[PDB]
Design a protein around this nucleic acid. Structure first.
Length: 54
DNA sequence: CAGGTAGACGCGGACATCAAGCCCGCCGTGAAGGTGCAGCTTCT
């Protein structure tokens, strides 16, 4: 199991929905809060979220 | 080559009730997955 690798424990970056045969980069970095009033995303100002793993 | 002016077209009252609306059987399947390693193969 320690020999078996592949995990990354993502938060907001899964390259695999975009044409799954694609060996790209996946990130675990939730973005900064937008300073502009109005729009919002990323599920980031409350109600803590689970972490994907690819 | 022409063909009218005027004025007005009613009120009332009512428009049904009864009873029931089926049963049977079934509903396609085939193809739409990636990653990692062991071993083979081909070439030098």
């Amino acid at each position: 199991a320690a020999r078996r690798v592949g995990q990354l424990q993502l938060v907001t970056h899964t390259l695999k929905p975009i044409h799954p045969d694609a060996r790209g980069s996946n990130l675990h970095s939730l973005p900064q809060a937008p300073g502009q009033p109005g729009l919002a995303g990323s599920h980031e100002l409350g109600d803590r979220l689970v972490s994907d793993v690819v």
